[PDB]
Each structure stands twice: as C-alpha cells, then as structure tokens.
Amino acid sequence: APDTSVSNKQNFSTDVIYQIFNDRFSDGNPANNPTGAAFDGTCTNLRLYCGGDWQGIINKINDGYLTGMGVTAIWISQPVENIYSIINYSGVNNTAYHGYWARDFKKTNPAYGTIADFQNLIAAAHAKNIKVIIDFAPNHTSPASSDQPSFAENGRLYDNGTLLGGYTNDTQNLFHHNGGTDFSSYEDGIYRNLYDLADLNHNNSTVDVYLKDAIKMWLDLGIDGIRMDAVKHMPFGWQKSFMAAVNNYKPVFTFGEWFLGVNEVSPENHKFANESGMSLLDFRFAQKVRQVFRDNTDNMYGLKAMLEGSAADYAQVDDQVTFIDNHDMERFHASNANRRKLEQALAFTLTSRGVPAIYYGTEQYMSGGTDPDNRARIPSFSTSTTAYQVIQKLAPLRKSNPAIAYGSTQERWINNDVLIYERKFGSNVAVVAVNRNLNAPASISGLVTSLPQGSYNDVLGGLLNGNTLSVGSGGAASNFTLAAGGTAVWQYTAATATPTIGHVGPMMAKPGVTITIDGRGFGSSKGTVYFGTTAVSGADITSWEDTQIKVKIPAVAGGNYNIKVANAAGTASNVYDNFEVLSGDQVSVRFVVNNATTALGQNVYLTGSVSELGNWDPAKAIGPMYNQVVYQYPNWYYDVSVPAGKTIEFKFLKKQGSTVTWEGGSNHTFTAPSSGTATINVNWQP
Ligand SMILES: OC[C@H]1O[C@H](O[C@H]2[C@H](O)[C@@H](O)[C@@H](O[C@H]3[C@H](O)[C@@H](O)[C@H](O)O[C@@H]3CO)O[C@@H]2CO)[C@H](O)[C@@H](O)[C@@H]1O
Ligand SMILES: OC[C@H]1O[C@H](O[C@H]2[C@H](O)[C@@H](O)[C@@H](O[C@H]3[C@H](O)[C@@H](O)[C@H](O)O[C@@H]3CO)O[C@@H]2CO)[C@H](O)[C@@H](O)[C@@H]1O
Ligand SMILES: OC[C@H]1O[C@H](O[C@H]2[C@H](O)[C@@H](O)[C@@H](O)O[C@@H]2CO)[C@H](O)[C@@H](O)[C@@H]1O
Ligand SMILES: OC[C@H]1O[C@H](O[C@H]2[C@H](O)[C@@H](O)[C@@H](O)O[C@@H]2CO)[C@H](O)[C@@H](O)[C@@H]1O
Ligand SMILES: OC[C@H]1O[C@H](O[C@H]2[C@H](O)[C@@H](O)[C@H](O)O[C@@H]2CO)[C@H](O)[C@@H](O)[C@@H]1O
Ligand SMILES: OC[C@H]1O[C@H](O)[C@H](O)[C@@H](O)[C@@H]1O
Numbered sequence: 257a258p259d260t261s262v263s264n265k266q267n268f269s270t271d272v273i274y275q276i277f278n279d280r281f282s283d284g285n286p287a288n289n290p291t292g293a294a295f296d297g298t299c300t301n302l303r304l305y306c307g308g309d310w311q312g313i314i315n316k317i318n319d320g321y322l323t324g325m326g327v328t329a330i331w332i333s334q335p336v337e338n339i340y341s342i343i344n345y346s347g348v349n350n351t352a353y354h355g356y357w358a359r360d361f362k363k364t365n366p367a368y369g370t371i372a373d374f375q376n377l378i379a380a381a382h383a384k385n386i387k388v389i390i391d392f393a394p395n396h397t398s399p400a401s402s403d404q405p406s407f408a409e410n411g412r413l414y415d416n417g418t419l420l421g422g423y424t425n426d427t428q429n430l431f432h433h434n435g436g437t438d439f440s441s442y443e444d445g446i447y448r449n450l451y452d453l454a455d456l457n458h459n460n461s462t463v464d465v466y467l468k469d470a471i472k473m474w475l476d477l478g479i480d481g482i483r484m485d486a487v488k489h490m491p492f493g494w495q496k497s498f499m500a501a502v503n504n505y506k507p508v509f510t511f512g513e514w515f516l517g518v519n520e521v522s523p524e525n526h527k528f529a530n531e532s533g534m535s536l537l538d539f540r541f542a543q544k545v546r547q548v549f550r551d552n553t554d555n556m557y558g559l560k561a562m563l564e565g566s567a568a569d570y571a572q573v574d575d576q577v578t579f580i581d582n583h584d585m586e587r588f589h590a591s592n593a594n595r596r597k598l599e600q601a602l603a604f605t606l607t608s609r610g611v612p613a614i615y616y617g618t619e620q621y622m623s624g625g626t627d628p629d630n631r632a633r634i635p636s637f638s639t640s641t642t643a644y645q646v647i648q649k650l651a652p653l654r655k656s657n658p659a660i661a662y663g664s665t666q667e668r669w670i671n672n673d674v675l676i677y678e679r680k681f682g683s684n685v686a687v688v689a690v691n692r693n694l695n696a697p698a699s700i701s702g703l704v705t706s707l708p709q710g711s712y713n714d715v716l717g718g719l720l721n722g723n724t725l726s727v728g729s730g731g732a733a734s735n736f737t738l739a740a741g742g743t744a745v746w747q748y749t750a751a752t753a754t755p756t757i758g759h760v761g762p763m764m765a766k767p768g769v770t771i772t773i774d775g776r777g778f779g780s781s782k783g784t785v786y787f788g789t790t791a792v793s794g795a796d797i798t799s800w801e802d803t804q805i806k807v808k809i810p811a812v813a814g815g816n817y818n819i820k821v822a823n824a825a826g827t828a829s830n831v832y833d834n835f836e837v838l839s840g841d842q843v844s845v846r847f848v849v850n851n852a853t854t855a856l857g858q859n860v861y862l863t864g865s866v867s868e869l870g871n872w873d874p875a876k877a878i879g880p881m882y883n884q885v886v887y888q889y890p891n892w893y894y895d896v897s898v899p900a901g902k903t904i905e906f907k908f909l910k911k912q913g914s915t916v917t918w919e920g921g922s923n924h925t926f927t928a929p930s931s932g933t934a935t936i937n938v939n940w941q942p
C-alpha cells in the first residue's frame with residue numbers, strides 16, 4: 257500500500273486531523289443522551305451533556321461534511337467510561353461531557369455509544385479513508401476529595417466493572433497523595449494532583465499493567481493513533497515504557513499534550529518528543545502562530561525563528577501535531593476580528609511541516625473564550641465558508657505533494673509582515689506566500705525558488721487574494737504584488753528517481769517489530785534497508801513499493817541507529833536518524849539513590865549496562881533525577897523504562913553541564929521484573 261493509504265497507522269504527515277469534541281459535534285442517537293440535570297439538548301449550558309455521539313460522527317462521515325473538506329483523520333474524545341456524577345463547583349453543575357474523567361478504561365462512555373457503535377465508527381471512517389485517533393488520559397481518573405469521599409465518585413477506578421479502589425482509604429497506593437501541583441517544576445506537576453483529579457500512581461504494578469492492558473483493547477478495536485493527555489504530568493520514563501508496550505504490540509502514531517505558553521521554548525519538551533516514543537502537539541508552533549496572525553505580539557521574523565528553531569530542536573519535526581487553537585484556548589477567531597486572520601493561519605498550518613490538526617468548528621468561524629465557551633455546539637455544516645474552501649483546497653496537497661508532507665522548510669522572502677517559504681522533498685516543491693498586513697500590499701522582487709521556470713497558478717485560486725507566479729531562469733520569480741492579506745500557494749510535482757525517505761514509524765521498538773519507511777523513489781523491487789551499518793534484505797522486508805517499505809527490525813544490540821535504504825540497483829537514500837532499537841520488552845522501574853549530595857546547579861543522573869541507560873555514556877545518562885516529592889534531597893529518584901527480566905549493572909552520576917562525577921566502588925546490580933513495576937533503592941557510593 258502507498259504511504260498515503262488510510263491503512264498507514266504509523267504516518268499522519270500526509271493527513272489533516274479534525275479534532276472532534278464528541279458531545280458538541282452531532283447527536284446521531286438521542287436514545288443514549290444523559291438525562292435530567294446532566295443534560296441540555298439546546299446546548300445552552302456548555303457544562304452539561306449536549307448529546308453529541310459516535311453515531312453523529314458516523315453520519316457526518318457518511319454525508320460528506322468531513323470528506324468534502326479534505327479531512328483524512330479525526331481525533332475524538334477519550335472513549336472510555338467516565339464518571340456519571342454531576343459535580344457542583346461553587347453553585348455550577350459540571351458533567352464529564354468532555355470525556356476526561358475516566359472511571360473504567362476498559363468500557364465505553366455510554367453517552368458516546370456502545371462497543372458496537374465504536375466498531376461501526378472505525379468501519380465507517382476507514383471506508384471513507386479517514387483514520388481514527390482516540391484521546392487517552394492515563395494521568396488520572398476523576399475529581400476527588402480525600403477527606404470527603406461523597407464528592408463525585410471519589411476518583412474510583414474500575415477494571416471492566418470490577419472496582420479496583422478509590423482515592424479515599426487508598427491502601428493499595430493506586431493514586432498519589434502528595435497534595436496538588438503548583439506547576440513550579442516538572443517533578444511537582446508529575447507527582448502531585450493536577451487540580452482535584454485523582455493522580456494515578458504508575459509505579460503501582462496494578463495501575464501499570466491495567467493501563468497497558470487497556471490500551472491494547474483499543475488497539476485491537478482498530479484505532480489508528482493516540483492523543484495522550486497531560487504527558488507533562490506523568491513520569492517520562494513510565495510513558496516510554498507505555499509507548500514500548502504499544503509499539504511492541506501494535507504501533508500507532510501517538511502524540512501527547514505538553515502545554516507551552518506564549519514565548520515558551522522548553523528543552524525538556526524537545527527531549528521528550530525526541531526520546532519518549534511519542535511526538536507532541538506543537539504548542540510552540542501554535543502559540544507563535546497566534547502571536548503573529550491573531551494577537552499581533554510578534555512578526556514574521558519570530559515565525560521564521562520558530563520554524564528554523566523547531567526544525568533543529570525536534571529530531572522528527574514532521575511528527576509534531578500543529579494547530580492554531582483547541583479546547584483549552586480561546587477560539588482563534590475573535591468575534592470582532594477580520595476573518596482573513598483565521599484563514600491565513602489555517603493556510604499556513606495546512607502547508608507547514610508536521611501533522612495539521614483543526615479544532616471542530618474552526619471552519620465555521622466559531623468564536624469563544626476559555627473553557628467552556630470554546631466548546632459550543634458546531635452552529636453549521638456549511639461547505640460554503642471561505643475557511644472550509646481553504647481547507648478543501650490545501651488539505652489534499654499533503655497527499656498529492658510530498659514536499660508538504662515531508663519537505664524541508666526554507667525562508668525565501670521576508671519582512672515584518674511577509675513570509676514566503678518553500679517546502680521541498682525529492683522532485684516536489686511547494687512555495688507559500690503570506691502577507692499578514694490586512695491594509696498594505698507588498699512588492700515582491702528578488703524572490704528565488706526551486707520551482708522550474710514557467711507559470712504557476714495559485715492553488716487557492718485567488719480565494720485569499722493570491723496571484724499567479726511567473727518563474728524565470730534559475731527559479732527567479734518576476735516582480736509581483738502580494739495583495740493586502742494575500743495568501744498564495746504554488747507547487748510542482750514529478751516522479752522522484754532517487755530513493756528518498758520522508759518518514760519512519762514507529763521510531764522506537766524491539767527487534768522483530770515491523771516499522772514503516774515512507775517516501776518516494778524506492779522503486780518497485782525490494783532493495784536493502786540499513787539500521788546503522790547493518791543491512792537488511794530479503795524475507796525480513798515484508799513488502800516494498802515506491803512510496804512505502806515494511807521491514808522487521810533486525811536483532812541488533814539496543815541503541816540509536818540511522819535508517820537508510822537502497823533501491824534494487826544499489827542507490828542509497830538520505831539518512832533518517834534517531835531510530836531507537838530497544839533491548840527487549842520494557843518495564844517501568846523506579847531508581848532511588850540515598851545521600852547523594854550536590855551543589856546548586858549540579859544534578860544526579862543514572863547510567864548503566866544497557867542502551868536504555870545509555871550504556872555507560874554520561875552524555876546519555878538518565879535524568880536529571882528528582883528530589884522533592886516522592887523522596888527528598890539528599891535522596892533522589894526517577895522512573896525509568898528498562899528491558900524486562902534483564903540483569904543490569906548501574907551507577908549514579910553527579911553532573912553539571914557535561915562535567916561528571918562517578919559513584920565510587922563497584923557497580924550496583926539488579927534484575928528487572930518480567931512484568932509490572934519495581935523499586936530499586938541503593939546508597940550513593942563515594
Ligand atoms: O530540586 C531540584 C534542584 O536539586 C538540586 O538542588 C539541591 C542542591 O544541589 C543542594 O545543595 C541543596 O541546596 C541548598 C543550597 O545549597 C543552600 O544554599 C540553600 O540555602 O538551601 C538549598 C536547599 O533547598 O538542596 C537542593 C535541593 O533542594 C540541584 O542542584 C538543582 O539544580 C535543582 O534545581
Ligand atoms: O566506560 C564503561 C565503564 O563505565 C563505568 O566505569 C566508571 C567507573 O565506575 C568510575 O569509578 C570511573 O572509574 C575511574 C576510577 O574511579 C579512577 O580511580 C581511575 O583512575 O579511572 C577510572 C576510569 O578509567 O569511571 C569509569 C568510566 O570511565 C562502569 O562502572 C564500568 O562497568 C564500565 O565498563
Ligand atoms: O486542563 C487544562 C490544562 O492545564 C494545564 O496546562 C497549564 C500549563 O501546564 C501551564 O504551563 C500554563 O500554560 O497554564 C496551562 C493552563 O491550561 C495542563 O498542563 C494541561 O495538561 C491541561 O490540559
Ligand atoms: O534574492 C535572494 C534573496 O531573496 C530573499 O531576500 C529578500 C528579502 O527577504 C526581502 O526583505 C527584500 O529585502 O528583498 C530581498 C530579495 O531582493 C531572501 O530572504 C534572501 O535570503 C535571498 O538571498
Ligand atoms: O476536571 C479538570 C479539567 O478536566 C478536563 O481538562 C482536561 C483538558 O481538557 C485536557 O486538554 C488536558 O490535557 O487534561 C485535562 C484533564 O483531563 C476538562 O476538559 C476541564 O474542563 C476540567 O477543568
Ligand atoms: O495569555 C493567554 C492566551 O491569550 C490569548 O488567548 C493568546 O492567543 C494565547 O496565545 C495566550 O496563551
């Protein structure tokens with residue numbers, strides 16, 4: 257199958273995601289609507305159930321609303337059973353219409369539908385070439401009060417009907433009892449409760465095994481991807497073990513929500529996306545887009561800096577899920593704002609690197625403040641808005657033009673208000689010109705592109721006042737006027753003769769797992785696949801065609817490898833780096849080291865005899881470790897994904913920058929559990 261097939265669960269870069277808030281999209285089955293004080297069919301009270309469900313999504317899939325827009329993937333609300341409690345917050349009733357208050361991860365939320373309804377949704381979506389992504393929130397269950405168990409459902413967790421436990425009298429330690437986070441540090445936001453939500457303890461074997469078994473059920477139901485909720489609030493090491501469980505079973509594209517504020521650039525964020533096994537929602541991209549196109553707090557130079565910076569900071573920038581707003585932000589379109597701002601932001605997002613995600617209703621110019629005002633019922637299913645047409649014209653380009661799906665990004669022209677950038681991949685090019693200034697046109701002279709000489713019509717057909725481009729010798733465009741609020745897209749596509757890798761997924765797994773290598777020019781006959789210097793050919797290459805290769809990971813030692821392929825003739829492709837071969841199945845283990853004193857700025861790290869611990873390379877040590885919540889300095893702790901049942905030798909380090917101080921004495925040693933979790937507690941050896 258081609259890289260663009262709906263069957264490709266490892267690659268969403270050629271897709272356009274439509275984020276659906278189930279309850280506020282379409283009520284296709286009134287029979288499953290909650291009743292009484294938990295329901296408002298008019299959807300005037302945005303804190304109660306409005307009725308939107310899976311049958312509604314099926315109907316909108318079947319009547320062409322999404323297909324006609326060019327949407328090829330949908331991200332829906334967490335499908336698991338939520339609490340049925342109506343929570344009163346200072347005189348205001350609240351329900352779990354949003355789906356983020358889970359009580360049983362192995363059952364469906366009856367308001368959305370039954371297991372059968374879910375199966376029909378997967379079927380209907382796939383029949384229309386639409387992939388299905390489910391939200392999944394394993395950080396917590398629901399709102400709870402430790403000393404007032406009558407509140408809500410006490411964050412109670414069930415396993416397919418069987419009660420596991422609640423927040424009160426939690427003798428099993430299924431949850432954290434470290435108070436609430438003040439967001440002062442990553443550790444604080446991870447091991448303390450997010451608001452009043454019962455924080456799940458992933459170091460508890462029951463919780464660990466339970467959640468991994470749960471995701472497997474959904475994977476068996478045929479989902480194509482996962483949107484992980486609040487990943488900044490769960491142990492990064494546990495999450496790596498979670499992604500390993502997914503990838504070593506049935507890998508699907510996974511991205512997490514790591515909120516970033518305006519002007520925030522987080523090294524920890526980059527590291528997570530680069531080493532966790534999942535990518536992230538691109539808040540850096542979203543916040544900068546809002547600054548430039550919505551709020552006028554930065555200009556095109558800032559947009560350019562974000563593009564060049566993110567391309568350098570993310571190992572796989574093409575896996576980051578871009579957006580201009582969501583359910584936790586004020587709607588991009590302000591009621592009294594010029595609609596061109598939203599239209600440009602959309603055009604920019606749809607033609608930029610990564611995986612574009614559109615919040616439902618954006619195409620209908622929905623406006624609204626913060627939660628819950630940004631979650632109104634979609635007011636119309638019109639295909640005639642300019643925004644709908646913008647998506648309709650550009651979304652399909654991610655399928656037809658690989659430069660947009662996998663291309664590099666290069667600024668070709670720029671000033672305060674204008675940015676003209678070029679996407680390029682193999683013998684494919686896309687050039688996009690955007691003038692955010694709504695009152696002043698720009699004179700574009702000196703523009704040079706990789707487009708072959710000739711005339712190029714605006715793909716948008718002048719919808720956003722774009723113009724035809726005249727390209728002369730060497731790719732130099734003749735002078736032209738970029739209209740006020742002008743946005744234009746020009747492109748060139750042709751067959752690529754040389755092997756070119758545009759994407760690889762999953763990027764982390766154990767030997768034997770099948771990965772997907774997508775691109776152009778691979779040829780029709782099986783070639784060779786390289787993991788570092790190791791060559792793979794023949795039987796282990798399950799299938800091979802010009803745009804997609806399916807190949808089993810070779811039994812090489814755990815570590816980081818560069819991926820490259822060569823066609824049957826022997827011509828090598830470009831290198832796609834940072835692929836991690838795991839040492840085997842993974843388990844989450846907490847390491848604790850006692851009395852490890854440091855000076856301010858100096859932190860303790862973990863190193864060891866397996867790639868999961870960096871194979872004794874300090875530059876690849878695990879950390880910085882924590883020392884505030886679960887354990888207190890001079891004691892440090894950290895949760896780490898390690899190979900199951902393996903005997904591992906390890907030592908702790910004290911690092912400041914790249915300067916490292918090693919533990920003295922002999923290596924510590926232990927054997928990782930075959931399943932579930934474990935805690936290894938040792939003393940720092942001078
Ligand atoms: O919690 C994350 C921080 O952990 C580490 O900080 C350690 C210091 O290394 C350690 O010396 C000690 O700091 C004390 C400091 O020396 C003293 O001047 C001050 O009056 O009290 C401090 C104790 O709070 O303890 C802290 C841990 O609290 C790490 O070095 C640092 O970079 C991390 O931010
Ligand atoms: O490089 C792989 C080895 O990494 C680890 O070895 C560490 C030691 O644990 C650590 O004590 C330190 O050893 C130095 C030693 O303290 C000092 O007296 C001597 O003069 O130099 C030693 C270094 O040559 O640093 C090494 C890493 O260089 C790990 O313990 C070991 O099993 C690995 O094989
Ligand atoms: O539930 C909303 C949202 O809350 C948190 O997001 C914070 C973020 O962490 C802070 O850095 C700052 O930006 O305020 C945000 C408020 O939304 C959680 O991190 C996030 O998961 C959650 O969706
Ligand atoms: O011509 C090559 C040149 O094109 C672009 O430069 C623009 C510049 O961005 C505009 O602000 C204005 O000064 O016109 C220039 C072209 O004459 C690229 O930005 C630049 O890197 C490139 O060399
Ligand atoms: O009950 C607290 C809040 O829970 C949800 O918030 C979600 C948020 O929408 C999601 O993006 C984030 O990643 O996780 C939190 C917790 O699941 C509700 O959507 C909010 O209305 C509540 O205030
Ligand atoms: O300051 C809070 C928020 O205000 C506006 O909604 C901005 O568009 C957004 O980027 C910012 O995060």
Ligand SMILES: [Ca+2]
Pocket residue numbers: 283284285286287288289307308309367
């Ligand atoms: Ca319904």
Ligand SMILES: [Ca+2]
Pocket residue numbers: 395445446447448455456489490491
């Ligand atoms: Ca947590």
Ligand SMILES: [Ca+2]
Pocket residue numbers: 570571572832833834
């Ligand atoms: Ca890379």
